[PDB]
Amino acid sequence: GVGISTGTFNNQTEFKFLENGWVYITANSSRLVHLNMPESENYRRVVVNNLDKTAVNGNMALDDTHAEIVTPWSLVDANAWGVWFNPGDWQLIVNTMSELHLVSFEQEIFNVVLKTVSESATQPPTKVYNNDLTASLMVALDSNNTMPFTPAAMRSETLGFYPWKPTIPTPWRYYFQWDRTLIPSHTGTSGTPTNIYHGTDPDDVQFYTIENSVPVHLLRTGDEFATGTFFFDCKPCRLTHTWQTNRALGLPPFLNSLPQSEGGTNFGYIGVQQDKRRGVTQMGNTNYITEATIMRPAEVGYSAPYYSFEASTQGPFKTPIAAGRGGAQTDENQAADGDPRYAFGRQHGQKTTTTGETPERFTYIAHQDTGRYPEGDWIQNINFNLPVTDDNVLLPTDPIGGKTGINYTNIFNTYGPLTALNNVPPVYPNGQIWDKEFDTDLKPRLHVNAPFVCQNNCPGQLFVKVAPNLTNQYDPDASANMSRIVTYSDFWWKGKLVFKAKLRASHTWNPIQQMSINVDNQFNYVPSNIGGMKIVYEKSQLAPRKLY
């Protein structure tokens, strides 16, 4: 019926404490989604080109050239932390939980409303909105994951984080195949390097369509759609950070002489000369046993080529790295490769009363200390004569290939059988929750964007489209675009995301770091006088844990 509501708005986070210290967390999110009709009812194949930018020698890092199928449909993506948890709930979770499991996910659409804009021809323009009770909203649910997976948080296009603000969906578009060549150059590179877009190789063409691969439900003003509960199987996400590096693994050396009076200069002394110490070292030609040369069980962290660009059929891409930098915690402005930087708009955290289109930005300096500090590690000759000379060492200050600004660490990879690393920490509120595992026979060990990875499947993507509202002059034989009555839709989206977490237990004398309100961040969690809201980034691994 038109006058009977088909659902209830619900945005309450529930905690239900189970046996053995586990907590059943239910995050109900509810939004009002506004949807305009598509620009055109037809699928487009658009080749986006920015050769003007890359035509300038040395700008190869600014390539946006690609090919995309632009579709008339719109994607309703809720794969972002902010959509589910308000700052207080996240504070509770990070301060008192230790591990997080993704349990279930369900979503539904109700109170579908379709309206048409009749723009009067009156000399002073005016427009009246009318309820078209017969219009239909097409809802498609890719339950079988037939369509390409296109997470929205990567582009900051998920639903809004404010329950009391209407949100808009994102027009769905998926990459089409293409070939590209961008020979790197630098300021001073003579001529124009080879920069060509070869087009689409026929063997790799895929042209998906929702109308052909997904059943489509037509919802009038009195209808509702529910996706049913989806159950995850993702690995647990740890809410604790590791501080121990190789230098802090195992039994420390025995201090034969200990300080006698408190002070900043009263250090402990091992006493025994370095060459006469007792231990085990992987270096078989030196008797010097040191805190640096001692044998650790394995390697915590791996050095990777940083700011290295790799070319493939589609052009250049930046090599990802799964660890943060060392010493970047001192200042966010001193961040470097590996620290994820998020840019977001007024829907996703930026002060809602800000003027201008400049996105709000922040670099997330993770609390885990498993990264690398390239200025430190060096290489020296096998003879290990000490002190080393210029001919027997390769310091980070040394050039490679004659380039004064590029040193050896830029092309150094220490990933090996002994490498150990942690999963990506959650980022609030702009961070993604789950991601799909790759279809490759051999699959990546971890993803750099989401902490939870679907082993089998992720929930089907939800697509919404205002059904065509034809005028009486329609003619399919006309090459011109279809004439449509201006129409839009407002519908309420309600989702339930269920987590399971473990409550932390104190295991040390000293307290641990905790998220708290303070005089500096006070006014970042309350509205301004003109209704301005914001959601600042919050750290998710404040509690430490021992690695070995």
């Epitope: 920015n50 050769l51 003007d52 300038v56 700008n59 060509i196 087009g199």
Partner: antibody
Amino acid sequence: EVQLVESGGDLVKPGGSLRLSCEASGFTFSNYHMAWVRQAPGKGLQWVANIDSGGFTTNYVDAVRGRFTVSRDNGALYLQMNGLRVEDTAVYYCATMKTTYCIDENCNSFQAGRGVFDNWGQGTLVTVSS
Amino acid sequence: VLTQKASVSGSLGQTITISCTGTSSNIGHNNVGWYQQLPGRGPRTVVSGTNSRPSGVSDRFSASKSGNTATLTISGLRADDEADYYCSTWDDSLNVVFGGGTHLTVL
């Protein structure tokens, strides 16, 4: 249709300064590299300067190098002229430098390039004398 | 400066050719553009490489490039073709280099 309109041409004294403008409409002005090209009375076309699509780099000819400057504001082009000399008297045009060239008739494949101007403005006359 | 012929002349309906020349190190690797210049008008791009013409340009124009030389062919002269023709390209010294022009004329 693409529209480029120049302005600012006028009589000026030698050794002074001036500002010529090139307003653009009907196309994505920010997606095209732009160029200032001058022609003296009855003489051939002479390249004055050029600027990329983001202002990262600008290039000049030796005759105006160190004297003039070029800038853009996503809506129009500007040429700042300093140390004007008698020979500078000429008509100036703003043209889009074709940054992409397709290599097939339907032009499914395209390549980067330089040295071809696609669209031109109207042009403006600058006279420097007493 | 690229080399060009000062002028040419021909009868109406004749298919004619004009040439622009320069060092292969600059006219070779870079593209070449041909523009028309009528009295009381700014240069109009007639040929933009790959024998492709801008919209609104008569199909009579054609162009080709080989090493030091670039050739522009007109398939049948018309009274409105009496005008200056200008070749331009990029130069590996990071310049934009034009030719001296050629005043096409009709007998």
